[PDB]
């Protein structure tokens, strides 16, 4: 965003950010990107290290 502003200017950068948001929201939506209890994988070594 910063380079786009300091190269092309204000007008392109405004719509650039708007499009970034419009696309990122829909893509993160259709990606699923959930979180489960299995997603947090503990290291099997942890037991030995702690001991």
């Amino acid at each position: 965003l910063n380079t786009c502003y300091r190269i092309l200017g204000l007008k392109p950068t405004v719509i650039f950010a708007d499009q970034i948001m419009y696309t990122g929201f829909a893509y993160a939506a259709r990606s699923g990107a959930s979180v489960g209890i299995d997603d947090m994988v503990i290291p099997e070594k942890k037991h030995e290290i702690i001991s």
Partner: peptide, 20 residues
């Protein structure tokens, strides 16, 4: 895993990466 697949109602195509 407590995670299943979900289908968007607007498109119908499932969401990748199962959703909790």
């Amino acid at each position: 895993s407590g995670q299943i697949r979900l289908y968007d109602g607007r498109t119908g195509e499932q969401f990748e990466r199962p959703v909790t």
